[PDB]
Amino acid sequence: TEFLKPRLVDIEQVSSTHAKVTLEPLERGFGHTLGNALRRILLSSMPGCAVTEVEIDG
């Protein structure tokens, strides 16, 4: 069996708006197993902070 090693990661970066991680190599079904897995993480569970509740004293 043979394996691949992720290389050439051409990070197109703009200060704070967005990062576009270009990267090779991905056989059929890996930009999937990873890409969707990441958006899953980014819409459902990512340990960060936020305001839970706000009481307007007025």
């Binding site: 059929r28 079904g29 197993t33």
Partner: protein, 52 residues
């Protein structure tokens, strides 16, 4: 054996014709036209892995 030995005459003049067979397996791929008996037609866009 008679049929095998002298039944090879084909065309006047060109009595020696060499016919060769070339078997070529052709598969299903992005661009094939698949349908059903009922009438519905179709052409495969992108045959995805069974993962999806």
């Amino acid at each position: 054996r008679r049929k095998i030995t002298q039944g090879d005459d084909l065309a006047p003049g060109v009595l020696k014709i060499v016919k060769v067979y070339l078997a070529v397996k052709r598969r299903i791929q992005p661009g094939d036209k698949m349908a059903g008996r009922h009438g519905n037609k179709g052409v495969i866009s992108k045959i995805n892995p069974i993962e999806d």
